[PDB]
Amino acid sequence: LTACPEESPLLVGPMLIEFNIPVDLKLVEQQNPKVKLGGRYTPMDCISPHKVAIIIPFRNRQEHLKYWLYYLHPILQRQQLDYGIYVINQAGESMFNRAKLLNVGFKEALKDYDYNCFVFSDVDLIPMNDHNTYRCFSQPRHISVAMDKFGFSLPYVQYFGGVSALSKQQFLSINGFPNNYWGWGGEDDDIYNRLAFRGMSVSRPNAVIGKTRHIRHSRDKKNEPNPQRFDRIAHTKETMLSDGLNSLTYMVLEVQRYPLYTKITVDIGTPS
Ligand SMILES: O=c1ccn([C@@H]2O[C@H](COP(=O)(O)OP(=O)(O)O[C@H]3O[C@H](CO)[C@H](O)[C@H](O)[C@H]3O)[C@@H](O)[C@H]2O)c(=O)[nH]1
Ligand SMILES: [Mn+2]
């Protein structure tokens, strides 16, 4: 077998993405027979150099996940990636911690396979163009650059929210993501700050092929705006060395392998 082409020859470009249609994971599993237990997929015709672990922070978003799975699997296969889906479900009813869950994802996924690339994605963001490859690049990759919720514009040039990708080494070089951001906001700016502090830059696809749709939803109880985010992000320089991968603690309560993804339910503690 030879190395897959640089550009998948299966891409179709723009696609129609809509969320008023109800979904059935059974049909999805059927329509994607190539996807193995735990939502694992490995190209058959060639050797993909992208061993992608796709991490999804999660709690009470089953319907969104449904759409996410319905749309992404077909796309990730067309992108010729050797990938796996990880839904990191936060146990309990305490404050949501997106960044911490992503860290857990990084660690737990590595126990399964020698992934060298990590895509961190909100459960509610779907790419509108399969040319927007869910893989890693020479530099940290911001993937959801043109969100319809922001009218296809980047809210500000340093925005790193939504969907992003870091290679194993890029992730490691910044001591991962912070674990101290409880509730909504700022964790993505901290991560951006970490990348810059390590002397890295953000790579992005152009605003056309980077178009993506957000599933409209209301706010979630237990993920209210974090009032401390403003000055927490103003101090990333001093906290990234001690807050991150090296200080990550958590308890996996249960691991379940479904046909389209692996669900890891974890106790990641509470704000202190
Ligand atoms: O109860 C919750 C809360 C959050 N999430 C997960 O965390 C993500 C972000 O939460 P929301 O979609 O409510 O957040 P927003 O739409 O504001 O998302 C945007 O703002 C966030 C602020 O923390 C993040 O930066 C995120 O990546 C960015 O796209 C969700 O997609 C989902 O994957 C859950 O599963 N359950
Ligand atoms: Mn959202």
Swiss-Prot record:
UniProt-annotated binding residues for Mn(2+): D124, H217
UniProt KW Coiled coil keyword: no
Disulfide linkage: C4-C46, C117-C136
Pathway annotation from the record: Protein modification; protein glycosylation
Keyword field contains Transferase: yes
UniProt keyword annotations, A-Z: Cell membrane, Cell projection, Disulfide bond, Glycoprotein, Glycosyltransferase, Golgi apparatus, Lipid metabolism, Manganese, Membrane, Metal-binding, Secreted, Signal-anchor, Transferase, Transmembrane, Transmembrane helix
Post-translational modification: The soluble form derives from the membrane forms by proteolytic processing.
Family affiliation: Belongs to the glycosyltransferase 7 family.
Protein name from the UniProt record: Beta-1,4-galactosyltransferase 1
Species name: Bos taurus
Full-length numbering of the shown residues: 131 to 402 of 402
